[PDB]
Design a binder for this molecule. Sequence first.
Ligand code: SAH
Ligand code: SAH
Lengths: 248, 248
Amino acid sequence: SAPILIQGAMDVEVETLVAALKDKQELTVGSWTYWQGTLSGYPVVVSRTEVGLANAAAATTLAMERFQPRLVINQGTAGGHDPALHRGDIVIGTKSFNMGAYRSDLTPAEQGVDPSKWHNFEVTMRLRDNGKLVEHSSFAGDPELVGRALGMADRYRHGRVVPGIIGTADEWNRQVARINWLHQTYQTAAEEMETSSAALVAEAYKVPFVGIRVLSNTDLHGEEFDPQTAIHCQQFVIDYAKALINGF
Amino acid sequence: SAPILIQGAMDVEVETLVAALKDKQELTVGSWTYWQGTLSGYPVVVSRTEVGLANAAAATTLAMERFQPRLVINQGTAGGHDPALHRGDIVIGTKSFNMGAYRSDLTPAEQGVDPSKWHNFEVTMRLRDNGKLVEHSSFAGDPELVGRALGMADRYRHGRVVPGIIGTADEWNRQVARINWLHQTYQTAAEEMETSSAALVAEAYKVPFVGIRVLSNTDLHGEEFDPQTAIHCQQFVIDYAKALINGF
Ligand SMILES: Nc1ncnc2c1ncn2[C@@H]1O[C@H](CSCC[C@H](N)C(=O)O)[C@@H](O)[C@H]1O
Ligand SMILES: Nc1ncnc2c1ncn2[C@@H]1O[C@H](CSCC[C@H](N)C(=O)O)[C@@H](O)[C@H]1O
């Protein structure tokens, strides 16, 4: 009875999921729409989160309060950070983190601006549990959920399914030198704008979480946005959810 | 009666507020704690949001769902961006925005990294209203709430009270050239890590919102963190809330 929550930011990242639901009921609260239905006879809630960290955290929190899901799959599109990956490849998030969180040391105006000196600002991922502070430098994908997606790699026929680190920021980077620096510094597979924020809320509520992201683009190979990748990602995630459901 | 919601991120930014409440009870869900009580006999909820955009959005959303407040005051400490301002001055947020949101045009690796080319990525503040996309390049503080705070300026005993733009980011900037660039580009009064995120959720729920921030520090004048500013801000906010309550 507790539903599986499946998230996407954009319309193109959720409409295939929504079409797969049986006996759909729609709910909109604030800026956030949910479709409550079934897959393989089991309750599933699809959430259109809108874009970015604030939207992701709001949409996830609202879903926790309204639906009490048993697990969360956050999915959608991303941009490549690892040169080994191409448009259409899918990253299963071994961990996600707030890549956009920056703290910098004091420098006078004369020294200019140097982002290579900025440090990851981990307080942005700090939480409390029963009122006690718990530090986080990243959020691990639930390792069984991660393993399951990797084991199903053969069922995805539009690229490779690989484990990787998902870097979350309110950013779309197209300065290739910046992408390279972020990859070298944080070992990122891909960048996007929601995962670690949804993951933060899932950790606060102690609900298993996994991020699943297709590269819709990568400037490391001159590969521009292809909307079909979002559809292919949802097809894989439907299969994945159905497998989980067969298991329940 | 629908409560006034008053927010602060850190313990030092809420303990004075909490001490002011009568007939309290303390509620924690996930990572977020709320104190429900009364000020001047009127219901008030004090929220400890924890730090950063994801936490602010989660804490605000959770408060909307649990308490349905009639208005939101987000307050706490900030770092100066405007050279005219000093530690202890209070900024009333005429608007707040996601200063950390960055989009850049394509540049090849050989051109390196140039943050002066990172433009504000407005999609991070885009919402939906009854299913329809609504752009936001910032969130205006409720203008009557803003005006009221400005009208009470001479009731603040420890510095100026000024209107200004609040720049929200998962960042603590201490590169003075970077502070200067953000101020020149966005006309920011001060920087902090929650306001526009809480504001985004308040806009989605159509609940009046105002940000009230004291400068606890500014590297434009070599003024390091002073925790007493946080206490002073809360005293001003209590006075302000009591004024609204008298009005109800
Ligand atoms: N290269 C990239 N960098 C950052 N986010 C990316 C990305 N590629 C895809 N994304 C994801 O896709 C969305 C991009 S922002 C949305 C842009 C789109 N034109 C619109 O108006 O809706 C975000 O949800 C983000 O998580
Ligand atoms: N100069 C500044 N830049 C960004 N945020 C600032 C700031 N000065 C104060 N803040 C605010 O104060 C908090 C700083 S991060 C918290 C740091 C503190 N040492 C701790 O561990 O709890 C954030 O909530 C932020 O909104």
